Amino acid sequence: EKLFTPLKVGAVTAPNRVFMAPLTRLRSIEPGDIPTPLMGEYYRQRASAGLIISEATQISAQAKGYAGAPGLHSPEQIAAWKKITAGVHAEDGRIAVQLWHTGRISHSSIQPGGQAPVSASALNANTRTSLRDENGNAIRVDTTTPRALELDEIPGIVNDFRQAVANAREAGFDLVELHSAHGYLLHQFLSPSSNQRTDQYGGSVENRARLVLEVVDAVCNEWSADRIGIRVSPIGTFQNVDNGPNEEADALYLIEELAKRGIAYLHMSETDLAGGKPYSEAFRQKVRERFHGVIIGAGAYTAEKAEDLIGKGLIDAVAFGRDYIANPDLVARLQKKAELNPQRPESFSGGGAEGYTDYPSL
Numbered sequence: 001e002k003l004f005t006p007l008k009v010g011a012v013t014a015p016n017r018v019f020m021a022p023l024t025r026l027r028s029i030e031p032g033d034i035p036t037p038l039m040g041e042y043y044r045q046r047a048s049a050g051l052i053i054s055e056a057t058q059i060s061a062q063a064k065g066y067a068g069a070p071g072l073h074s075p076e077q078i079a080a081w082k083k084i085t086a087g088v089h090a091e092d093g094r095i096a097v098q099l100w101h102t103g104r105i106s107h108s109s110i111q112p113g114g115q116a117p118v119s120a121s122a123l124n125a126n127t128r129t130s131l132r133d134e135n136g137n138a139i140r141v142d143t144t145t146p147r148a149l150e151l152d153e154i155p156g157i158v159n160d161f162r163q164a165v166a167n168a169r170e171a172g173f174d175l176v177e178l179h180s181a182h183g184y185l186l187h188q189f190l191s192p193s194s195n196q197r198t199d200q201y202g203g204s205v206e207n208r209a210r211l212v213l214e215v216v217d218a219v220c221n222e223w224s225a226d227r228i229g230i231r232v233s234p235i236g237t238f239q240n241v242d243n244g245p246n247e248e249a250d251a252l253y254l255i256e257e258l259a260k261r262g263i264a265y266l267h268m269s270e271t272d273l274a275g276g277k278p279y280s281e282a283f284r285q286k287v288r289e290r291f292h293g294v295i296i297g298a299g300a301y302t303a304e305k306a307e308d309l310i311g312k313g314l315i316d317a318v319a320f321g322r323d324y325i326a327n328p329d330l331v332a333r334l335q336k337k338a339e340l341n342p343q344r345p346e347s348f349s350g351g352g353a354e355g356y357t358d359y360p361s362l
């Protein structure tokens with residue numbers, strides 16, 4: 001077994017390869033999109049993970065697409081996250097913040113000024129996001145048609161990622177993960193399905209990847225390349241965003257570009273919850289030969305699949321999502337071959353302590 005052996009992940013050393021995937025739980029305070037001590041307790045419970053990757057966190061108020069998702073743009077958010085990271089560190093854990101802009105997976109009612117959310121192009125996501133009703137409970141609501149960003153707005157978006165990274169470093173995170181997956185803003189630019197622009201940010205794969213690579217360069221400059229990871233979902237369809245008619249070649253282009261920056265890790269979200277065709281081993285080999293940082297695999301993994309792919313030299317670590325919701329001590333359970341706690345999906349999104357901090361350890 002290799003899952004319980006250490007791994008250098010850029011600037012930090014994980015004691016094992018069992019990572020906590022980023023999981024949106026929608027329990028932040030409004031007004032202010034503020035993390036809470038309850039969230040702190042939840043993360044502290046999971047500190048034995050090789051690496052915790054936080055729930056997706058707004059780089060700016062405009063970035064918001066979900067009621068209850070936290071930000072990392074305001075003083076009050078910075079202060080609240082500082083307490084959370086301190087708690088994880090007191091338990092000898094490591095925690096990365098996943099930073100997003102939701103782009104068109106959003107609703108005007110939660111945007112600044114009540115305005116349409118932004119994207120690469122003015123095309124509805126044709127999906128839902130999560131708002132809160134009058135009692136503060138999560139509700140699914142159809143997405144608002146976005147406004148296409150003007151060319152002169154792009155530097156501001158890059159700066160918002162840069163600023164959020166400055167704030168994340170201050171807040172005590174060990175790493176940052178850029179959310180370039182699952183049909184959110186960066187992926188909206190990457191995908192031809194959502195990007196119909198005819199300027200330098202659309203058309204060719206070079207142009208479609210331009211924004212994400214500008215963001216990577218800006219955040220490496222703000223902090224250090226060995227503090228930066230990126231999550232992609234570049235093969236298949238996620239929240240109605242496919243990866244276009246040349247998905248493999250386009251993915252390999254992006255990955256070769258990322259490699260030039262010497263970033264800490266590449267996190268591949270391989271499938272959504274409904275599943276689909278597995279990655280070919282040929283594709284995994286092509287990725288592996290092009291990227292020289294850590295590769296994290298995710299999407300309905302088992303420990304056995306993770307061991308197989310680590311043993312084949314194709315990935316370095318695995319991120320578990322739902323098993324981490326339900327098992328604060330997932331590392332010990334996988335090490336001991338213990339049963340896993342029964343998941344309660346009704347409390348994944350929104351609410352309070354129930355279904356959040358009340359899953360027991362062994």
Ligand SMILES: Cc1cc2nc3c(=O)[nH]c(=O)nc-3n(C[C@H](O)[C@H](O)[C@H](O)COP(=O)(O)O)c2cc1C
Nearest residue numbers: 021022023024055056298299300301320321322348
């Ligand atoms: C409730 C829930 C929230 C999620 N939130 C995020 C998120 O904030 N960021 C992200 O990149 N993926 C998110 N995902 C996807 C998970 O990180 C993970 O890739 C997915 O659940 C599949 O892995 P699993 O089979 O181990 O759960 C979420 C998944 C679930 C079920």
